[PDB]
From a paper:
By performing a screen based on affinity purification and mass spectrometry, we observed that a previously uncharacterised phage protein specifically binds to two RNA binding sites within the CTH of [name], and by doing so efficiently inhibits the RNA binding and degradation activity of the degradosome assembly. We have determined the structure of this protein (termed Dip, ‘degradosome interacting protein’) by X-ray crystallography and show that it forms an open-clamp like homo-dimeric structure, and binding of Dip to RNA binding regions within [name] is characterized functionally and structurally. As with the 756–775 binding site, 9S rRNA can be competitively displaced from the 583–636 fragment by Dip, and the addition of a 4-fold excess of Dip is able to completely remove the bound RNA from the [name] fragment. These results demonstrate that Dip targets both RNA binding sites in the C-terminal half of the RNA degradosome, and consequently blocks the binding of RNA to the [name] subunit.
To further study the interaction between Dip and [name], modelling experiments were performed to predict the binding surface for one of the Dip binding peptides of [name] [name] (residues 756–775). Secondary structure prediction of this [name] peptide in isolation suggested a high propensity towards a helical conformation. Therefore, this helical form of the peptide was used in a docking experiment intended to scan the complete surface of Dip with the DOT docking program. The best energetically ranked complexes show binding of the peptide to a negatively charged patch on the outer surface of the Dip-dimer. To verify the in-silico docking results Dip was co-crystallized with the 756–775 peptide of [name] [name]. Hexagonal crystals of Dip were obtained containing an apparent ring-like hexamer of Dip formed through crystallographic symmetry. Discontinuous density was observed on the surface of Dip in the DOT docking predicted acidic pocket. Processing the X-ray diffraction data in the lower symmetry P1 space group visibly improved the density for the [name] peptide, and we were able to cautiously model eight amino acids of the peptide into this density. The model of Dip bound to the short [name] recognition peptide (Dip:RNaseE756-775) indicated significant contacts are made between residues Asp 137, Asp138, Glu 214 and Glu 222 of Dip and the [name] peptide. A double mutation of Glu 214 and Glu 222 to alanine was sufficient to completely abolish the interaction with both Dip binding sites on [name] when assessed by an electrophoretic mobility shift assay. There were no other significant alterations to the local or overall structure of Dip (data not shown). These data show that the acidic patch on the outer surface of Dip is crucial for the interaction with [name], and both of the RNA binding segments of [name] engage Dip via this region.
Residue numbers in the entry:
A (entry chain E): 4 to 34, 36 to 57, 59 to 111, 113 to 117, 124 to 238, 241 to 259
B (entry chain F): 761 to 762, 766 to 769
C (entry chain A): 3 to 34, 38 to 62, 64 to 119, 124 to 235, 241 to 256, 258 to 266
D (entry chain C): 761 to 762, 764 to 770
């Protein structure tokens, strides 16, 4: 159908802390198979014209899935709430070799290797099976402990990433608080080559049933300080990618 | 409407 | 400023011997001191646009069209039968030889859904961009084009056959299907870097509608034909993406 | 010409 920036900004008006949003515009949503019971929406902006998006538990509706368009972009605009926003700015500026795009930071000099990804609108519990199958085992990650952040991240950026994490935790627990408090979900998955820890949060909004946001640290089997026999190869800065047609 | 960590 | 129509394009591409299955064509939209360099921008939906920079040789809205034609034909030289199928030899002649239509690479992962060895470069010639490479390279060399013994040098023997046949097929086309009155000799130059060896095969050909057509193919051979750096799976995690804003937090 | 003639030998 047709949401307008009036409804978007009306929903974002009740997100505490945000004071500098990026440019929004009207979209056009179009949207379901009875097999597997899935509604995959898509909608057309006018400056990017590419966004597609869940498994419902009730009879769909036009008004129904716009609650979810608001769930997604409400979850996205959380990255601009100031304390969280430049709480990420601190981890990016805190290292001269952390390159960003607004959604993931982490090489190479050619005209990026993920270290931490911002995943708005999703939760680890909703995708947990695909990781429990693929992971060697699972672990727990104490958020208040600085040493674990000294494990996944080097001691240079451990603190910044830490109170970035519990910055999101405080924001969801106090500015997106439900009447019945929601506990944050932190889940560790060990792989053969890396270590993936997920920090997922649910938040209360009046216009939406729920808001979801998770952040993923990946700490590879190799240290950043060592391994350098691999990163010093200038074949890195010689690779790009393109279509395979 | 029509939570994970209960 | 003006609007070429695509039949003015295929009026020039019709004079390409062997061109029987050309690319999808549309109308290019023209939009064209600083070293006297001239920049011309071509808008077309699709793919929306593109741009070219070149030396002015007094420019006008009648010769810039000649330029953009001189490169349209140059690119369409990769679908004339006898050189396209010769490419297909080089892509199908290896399991991990991925192609883009402009470059080819090896291994790697999409993740979402390469490493240049052969870059097809239309609208270029090493003579015009040499001086930027002699300074950056340690030294230069010769590459005997009609002999393979060096094609085993640049690429393994699994691809030296079809690579040699490809570049020599380009040589045959440019020397026999677009030959000048005084024939132009192909220019093949090799440059040795500290991490790789780059070779460029450059050809000039005569077309009735434009002053000249040129085409170069670059093939780079790295110092290793170990090479288990290609087996590290951290390279299966690499993506590409950086907004800038005055932010002060101190 | 019309600027050409690079390697005519």
């Amino acid at each position: 159908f047709n949401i307008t920036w009036e409804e978007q900004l009306q929903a974002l008006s009740k997100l505490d802390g945000l004071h500098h949003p990026h440019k929004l515009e009207d979209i056009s949503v179009h949207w379901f198979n009875p097999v597997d019971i899935s509604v995959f929406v898509t909608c057309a902006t006018m400056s990017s014209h590419n966004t597609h998006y869940f498994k419902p538990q009730s009879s769909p509706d036009d008004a129904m899935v716009r609650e979810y368009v608001l769930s997604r972009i409400i979850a996205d605009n959380l990255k601009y709430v100031d304390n969280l926003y430049l709480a990420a700015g601190a981890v990016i500026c805190g290292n001269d070799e952390y390159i960003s795009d607004g959604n993931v930071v982490g090489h190479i000099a050619d005209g990026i290797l993920p270290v931490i990804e911002f995943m708005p609108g999703v939760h680890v519990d909703d995708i947990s099976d695909k990781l429990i199958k693929s992971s060697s085992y699972q672990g727990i990650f104490k958020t208040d402990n600085l040493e674990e952040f000294e494990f996944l991240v080097d001691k240079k950026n451990a603190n910044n990433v830490k109170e970035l994490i519990l910055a999101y935790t405080d924001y969801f627990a106090n500015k997106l608080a439900f009447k019945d408090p929601a506990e944050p979900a932190v889940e560790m998955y060990q792989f053969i080559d890396r270590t993936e820890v997920y920090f997922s949060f649910e938040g209360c909004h009046p216009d939406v049933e729920e808001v979801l946001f998770t952040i993923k640290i990946v700490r590879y089997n190799q240290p950043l300080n060592s391994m350098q026999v691999f990163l010093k190869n200038p074949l890195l800065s010689h690779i790009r990618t393109v279509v395979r047609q | 409407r029509s939570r994970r960590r209960s």
